[PDB]
mmCIF file of C-alpha atoms and ligand atoms in Angstrom:
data_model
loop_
_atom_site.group_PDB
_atom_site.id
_atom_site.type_symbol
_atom_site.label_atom_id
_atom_site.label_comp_id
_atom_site.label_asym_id
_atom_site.label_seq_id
_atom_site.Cartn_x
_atom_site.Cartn_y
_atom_site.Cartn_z
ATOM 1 C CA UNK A 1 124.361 110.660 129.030
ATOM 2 C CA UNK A 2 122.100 113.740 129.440
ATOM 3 C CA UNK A 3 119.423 111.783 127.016
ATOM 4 C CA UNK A 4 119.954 108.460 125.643
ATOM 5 C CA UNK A 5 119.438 106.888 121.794
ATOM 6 C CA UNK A 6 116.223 106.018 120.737
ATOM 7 C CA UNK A 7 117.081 102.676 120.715
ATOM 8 C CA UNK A 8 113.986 101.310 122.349
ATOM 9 C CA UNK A 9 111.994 103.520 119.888
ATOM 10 C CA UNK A 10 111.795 100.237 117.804
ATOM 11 C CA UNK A 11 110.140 98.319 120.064
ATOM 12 C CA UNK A 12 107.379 101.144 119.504
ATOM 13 C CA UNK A 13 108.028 101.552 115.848
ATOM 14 C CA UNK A 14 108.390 97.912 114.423
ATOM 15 C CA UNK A 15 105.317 97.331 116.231
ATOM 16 C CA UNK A 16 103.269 99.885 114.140
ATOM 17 C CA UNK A 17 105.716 99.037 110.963
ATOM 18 C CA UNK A 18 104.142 95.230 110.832
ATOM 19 C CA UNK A 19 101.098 96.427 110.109
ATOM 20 C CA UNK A 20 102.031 99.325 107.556
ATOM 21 C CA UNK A 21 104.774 97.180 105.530
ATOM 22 C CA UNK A 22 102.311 94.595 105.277
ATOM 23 C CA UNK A 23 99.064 96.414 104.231
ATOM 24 C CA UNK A 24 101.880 98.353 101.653
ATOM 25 C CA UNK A 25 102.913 95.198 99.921
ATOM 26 C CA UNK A 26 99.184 93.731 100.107
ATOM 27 C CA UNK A 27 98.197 92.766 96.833
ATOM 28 C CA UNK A 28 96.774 89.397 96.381
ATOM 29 C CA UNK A 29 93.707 87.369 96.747
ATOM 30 C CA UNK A 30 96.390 85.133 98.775
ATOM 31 C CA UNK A 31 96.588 88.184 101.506
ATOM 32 C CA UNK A 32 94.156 87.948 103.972
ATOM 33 C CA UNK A 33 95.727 89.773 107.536
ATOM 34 C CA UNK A 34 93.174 91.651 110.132
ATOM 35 C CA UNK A 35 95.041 94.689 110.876
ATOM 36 C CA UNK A 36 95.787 94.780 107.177
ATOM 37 C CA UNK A 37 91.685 95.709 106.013
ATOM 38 C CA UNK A 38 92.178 98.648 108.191
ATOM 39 C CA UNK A 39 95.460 99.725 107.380
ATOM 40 C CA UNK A 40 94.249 100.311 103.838
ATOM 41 C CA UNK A 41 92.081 103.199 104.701
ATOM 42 C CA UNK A 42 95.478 105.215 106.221
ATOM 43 C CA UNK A 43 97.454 104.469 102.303
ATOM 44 C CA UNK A 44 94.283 105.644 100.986
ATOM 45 C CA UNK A 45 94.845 109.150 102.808
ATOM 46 C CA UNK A 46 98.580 109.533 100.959
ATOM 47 C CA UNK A 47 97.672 108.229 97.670
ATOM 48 C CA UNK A 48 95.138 111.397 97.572
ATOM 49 C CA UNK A 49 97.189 114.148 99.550
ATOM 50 C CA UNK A 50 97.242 116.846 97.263
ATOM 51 C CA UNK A 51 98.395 118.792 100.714
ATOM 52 C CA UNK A 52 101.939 117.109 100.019
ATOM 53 C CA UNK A 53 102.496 119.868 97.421
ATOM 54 C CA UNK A 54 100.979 123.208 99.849
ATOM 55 C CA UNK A 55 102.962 121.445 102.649
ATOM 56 C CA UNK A 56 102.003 117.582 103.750
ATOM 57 C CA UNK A 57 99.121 116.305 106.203
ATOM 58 C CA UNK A 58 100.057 115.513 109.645
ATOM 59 C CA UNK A 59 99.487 111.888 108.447
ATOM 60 C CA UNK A 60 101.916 112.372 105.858
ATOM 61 C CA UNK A 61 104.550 114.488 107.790
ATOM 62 C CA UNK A 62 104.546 112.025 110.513
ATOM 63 C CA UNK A 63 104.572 108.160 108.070
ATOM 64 C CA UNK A 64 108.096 110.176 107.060
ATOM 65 C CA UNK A 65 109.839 109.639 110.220
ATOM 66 C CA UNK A 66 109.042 105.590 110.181
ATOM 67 C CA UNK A 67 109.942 105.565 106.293
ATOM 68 C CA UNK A 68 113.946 105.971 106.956
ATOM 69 C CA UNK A 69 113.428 104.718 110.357
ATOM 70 C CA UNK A 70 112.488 101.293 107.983
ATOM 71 C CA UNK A 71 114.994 102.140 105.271
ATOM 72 C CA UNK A 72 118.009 101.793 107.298
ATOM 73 C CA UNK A 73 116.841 97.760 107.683
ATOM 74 C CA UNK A 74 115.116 97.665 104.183
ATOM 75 C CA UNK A 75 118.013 98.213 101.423
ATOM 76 C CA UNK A 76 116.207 95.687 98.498
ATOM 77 C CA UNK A 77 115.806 95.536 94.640
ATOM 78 C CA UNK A 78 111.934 96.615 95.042
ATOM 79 C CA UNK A 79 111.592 97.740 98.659
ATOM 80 C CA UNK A 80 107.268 97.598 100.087
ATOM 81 C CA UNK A 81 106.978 100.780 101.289
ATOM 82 C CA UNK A 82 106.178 103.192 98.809
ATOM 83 C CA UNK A 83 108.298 106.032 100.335
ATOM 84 C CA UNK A 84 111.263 103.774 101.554
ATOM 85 C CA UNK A 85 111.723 102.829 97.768
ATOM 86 C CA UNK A 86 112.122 106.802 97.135
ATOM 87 C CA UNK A 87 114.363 106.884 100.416
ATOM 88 C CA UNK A 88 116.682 104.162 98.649
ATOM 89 C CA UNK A 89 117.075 106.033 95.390
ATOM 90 C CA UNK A 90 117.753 109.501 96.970
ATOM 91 C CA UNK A 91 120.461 107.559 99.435
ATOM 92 C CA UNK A 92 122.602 110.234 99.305
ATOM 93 C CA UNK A 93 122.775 112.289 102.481
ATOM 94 C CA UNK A 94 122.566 109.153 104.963
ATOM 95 C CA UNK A 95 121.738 111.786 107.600
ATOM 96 C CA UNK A 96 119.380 114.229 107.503
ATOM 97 C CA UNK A 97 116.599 111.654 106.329
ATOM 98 C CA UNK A 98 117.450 108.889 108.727
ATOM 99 C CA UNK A 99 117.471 111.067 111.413
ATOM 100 C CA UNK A 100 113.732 111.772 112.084
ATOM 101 C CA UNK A 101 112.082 112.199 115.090
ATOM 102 C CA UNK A 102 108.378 113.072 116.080
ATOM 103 C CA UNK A 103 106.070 113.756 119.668
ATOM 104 C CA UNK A 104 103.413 111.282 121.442
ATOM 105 C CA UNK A 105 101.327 112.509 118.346
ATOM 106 C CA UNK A 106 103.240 109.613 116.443
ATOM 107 C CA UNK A 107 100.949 107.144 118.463
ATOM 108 C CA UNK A 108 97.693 108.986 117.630
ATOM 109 C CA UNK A 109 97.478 108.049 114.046
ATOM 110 C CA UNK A 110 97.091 104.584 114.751
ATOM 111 C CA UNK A 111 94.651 105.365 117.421
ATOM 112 C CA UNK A 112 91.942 107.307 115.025
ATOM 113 C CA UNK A 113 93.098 104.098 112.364
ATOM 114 C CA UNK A 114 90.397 101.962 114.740
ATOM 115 C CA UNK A 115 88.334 105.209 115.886
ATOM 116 C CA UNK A 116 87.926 107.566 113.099
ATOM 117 C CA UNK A 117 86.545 110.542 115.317
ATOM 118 C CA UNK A 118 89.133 113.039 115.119
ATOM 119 C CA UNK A 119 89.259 114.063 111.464
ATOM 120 C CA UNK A 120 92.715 115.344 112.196
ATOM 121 C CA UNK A 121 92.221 118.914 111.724
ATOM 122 C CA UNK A 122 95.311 120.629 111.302
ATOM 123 C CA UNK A 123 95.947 123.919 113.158
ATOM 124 C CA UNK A 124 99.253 125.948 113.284
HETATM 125 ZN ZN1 LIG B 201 97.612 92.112 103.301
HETATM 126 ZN ZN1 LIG B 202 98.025 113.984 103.498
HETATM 127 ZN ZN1 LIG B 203 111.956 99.097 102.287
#
């Protein structure tokens, strides 16, 4: 067609999803992963965003689009992610939320993950 279906987007996504799903549901002495250590830093940044209520850190706004993009695929009793398990209680629109899609600057999160020098200062 004009543009096709981002169906290789989860080649891209899962990739970055193995790491986050993980790190979510890491909670053990048992759980010992190396991208894991560092993803805990990035659920550090959402379990203090105060921002969510003046509006949501690009961090934030951006972790959305991978939450229903996992959702679809993760329909359990006590799903990992944090905001998939909200996703699965408010699974009422099957739309709107599902149907999320952000820029390159999707990649860059995981980037500054490794190399924190960016402070990712918002602008307009
Ligand atoms: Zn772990
Ligand atoms: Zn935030
Ligand atoms: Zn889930």
């Amino acid at each position: 067609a004009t543009q096709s279906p981002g169906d290789s987007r989860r080649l891209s996504i899962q990739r970055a999803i193995q790491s986050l799903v993980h790190a979510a549901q890491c909670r053990n002495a048992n759980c010992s992963l190396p991208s894991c250590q560092k993803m805990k830093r990035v659920v550090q940044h959402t379990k203090g965003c105060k921002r969510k209520t003046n509006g949501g850190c690009p961090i934030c706004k951006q972790l959305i689009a991978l939450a229903a993009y996992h959702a679809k695929h993760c329909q359990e009793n006590k799903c990992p992610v944090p905001f998939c398990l909200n996703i699965k209680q408010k699974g009422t629109i099957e739309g709107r939320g599902n149907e999320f899609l952000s820029p390159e600057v999707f990649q860059h999160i995981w980037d500054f993950l490794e190399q924190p020098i960016s402070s990712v200062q918002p602008i307009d």
